[PDB]
């Protein structure tokens, strides 16, 4: 249990080994959640990458934010997947926030502090509590089957998970860096382990 | 009668069922009005959508703001229709305000807080008091004949209707979120009912 505030996970090599298994006390399968994270990578104009990965023994990509190469942010829940069109991707750190829910399938994918229009996904679906959250790898199984092409080779931090859809003002505040209580997983109270050549050093973004 | 401030209607699926019938105490056929609403959707670059719909037993689109696909905002009054050219539509929430009047046919279509040049429409025409205001559907009848292609699949809120053309400073204030008295229909004092898969949750836009 380490506080990662003002620090980010160093992802500098494309590989199937670089990753970080983020532990979470989550026990009840999530009927609603929100993952916020400030990441930064220049692979946006070279290939896609797993921005954030969440697996289950049933679903390898139970919750996964990925850079659809040449199309923006593909966010997936429970295998099913939706896509947020990024008209132009800039070389600059970006703070994403996706807020899928299991009733209305609603996803407030706040990007760089700005909102992406809510779109249905996996409506009335329960996210498996047991998870092998990982970064840098689109896991095709529970923390396994990693691919460099699908890997993040930049850096990422502020990874916070809530069991509820944060209010838009709350998401704004997460962007502003104010306090929060990410019950499911919290960057400032983050339990995790590192595998491969992933380091960890002070986050670039403000 | 529910206050929808800081909340928006969740429109996440293209369908002819998703809609919200907004009740209004309006009794005298409107010789002048103004609808302001902050909506957000990415269909702007995929197809058109009914941003706001207002029907009568005589006219199905008695008052209707729609996204003319590849041409901006088509605003219609009493069947007749005018079009505001949007040179480029950005993925971002926008606050529209149209102000048709029955004497000069004038329409101050304030968009994103900025004005669209006044243009005549339906001059000397009375808007039917009885209405089946709906969102997400270009109704070809009184609250009926909905089409997914003509449907809004984003979200919308701050839907306020006045029986008078608000002063431009007043419209600015509506954009700023200050207080107002939308006699005809008021988001903060909104009477309505929901049909289809439309949810309602905290509005994304500031």
């Amino acid at each position, epitope marked *: 249990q380490t506080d990662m505030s003002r620090k980010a996970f160093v992802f500098p090599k494309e590989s199937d080994t670089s990753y970080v298994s983020l532990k979470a006390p989550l026990t009840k399968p999530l009927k609603a959640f929100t993952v916020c994270l400030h990441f930064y990578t220049e692979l946006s104009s070279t290939r896609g990458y797993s921005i954030f990965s969440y697996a289950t023994k049933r679903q390898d990509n139970e919750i996964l934010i990925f850079w659809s190469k040449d199309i923006g942010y593909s966010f997936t829940v429970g*295998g099913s*997947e*939706i*896509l947020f069109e990024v008209p132009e991707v800039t070389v600059a750190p970006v703070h994403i926030c996706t807020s899928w829910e299991s009733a209305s399938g609603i996803v407030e994918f706040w990007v760089d502090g700005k909102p992406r229009v809510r*779109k249905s996904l*996996k409506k009335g679906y329960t996210v498996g509590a047991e998870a092998s959250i990982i970064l840098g790898q689109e896991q095709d199984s529970f923390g396994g089957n990693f691919e460099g092409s699908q890997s993040l080779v930049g850096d990422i931090g502020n990874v916070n998970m809530w069991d509820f859809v944060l209010s838009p003002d709350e998401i704004n505040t997460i962007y502003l860096g104010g306090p929060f209580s990410p019950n499911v997983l919290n960057w400032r109270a983050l339990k995790y382990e590192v595998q491969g050549e992933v380091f960890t050093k002070p986050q670039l973004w403000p | 009668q529910t206050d929808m401030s800081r909340k928006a209607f969740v429109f996440p699926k*293209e369908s002819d069922t998703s809609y919200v019938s907004l009740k209004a105490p309006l009794t005298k056929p409107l010789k002048a009005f103004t609808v302001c609403l902050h909506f957000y959707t990415e269909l702007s*670059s*995929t197809r058109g959508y009914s941003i706001f719909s207002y029907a009568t037993k005589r006219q199905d689109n008695e008052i209707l703001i729609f996204w003319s*696909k590849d041409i901006g905002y088509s605003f219609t009054v009493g069947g007749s229709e005018i079009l505001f050219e949007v040179p480029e539509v950005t993925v971002a929430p926008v606050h529209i305000c149209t102000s048709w009047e029955s004497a000069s046919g004038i329409v101050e279509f304030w968009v994103d807080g900025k004005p669209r040049v006044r243009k005549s429409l339906k001059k000397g025409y009375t808007v039917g008091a009885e209405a089946s205001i709906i969102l997400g559907q270009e109704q070809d009848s009184f609250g009926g004949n909905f089409e997914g292609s003509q449907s809004l699949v984003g979200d919308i809120g701050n839907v306020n209707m006045w029986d008078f053309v608000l002063s431009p400073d007043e419209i600015n204030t509506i954009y700023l979120g200050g207080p107002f008295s939308p006699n005809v229909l008021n988001w903060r004092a909104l009477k309505y009912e929901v049909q289809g898969e439309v949810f309602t949750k905290p509005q994304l836009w500031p």
Partner: nanobody
Amino acid sequence: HVQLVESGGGLVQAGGSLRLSCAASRDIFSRYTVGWYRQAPGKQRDLVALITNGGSTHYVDSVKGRFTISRDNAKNTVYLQMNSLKSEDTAIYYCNAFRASFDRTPLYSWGQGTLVTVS
């Protein structure tokens, strides 16, 4: 056995509309992010468009607005409405089903395609 249905093709005068079908055995397309590729003669196996499992869709710049791909989950018959078919569009359209949206290049199950002639 997958045998992506390739139908709804034929001859259409340029800038018209034609409904391409994409039916799936069982419910497979539910997990697949299915996509239409244009294998035009002397041309590539490039994707004209694609649609995510959830329902969101993308169309390549050359096809922006040109066509609209939707997921028909009732029978796995994802439909593709082609509007304003310019001559370039003339090609054989391969409706393939890869699994997730990021991995456009993989195709897994392969079909036969449907011809399109823009006159």
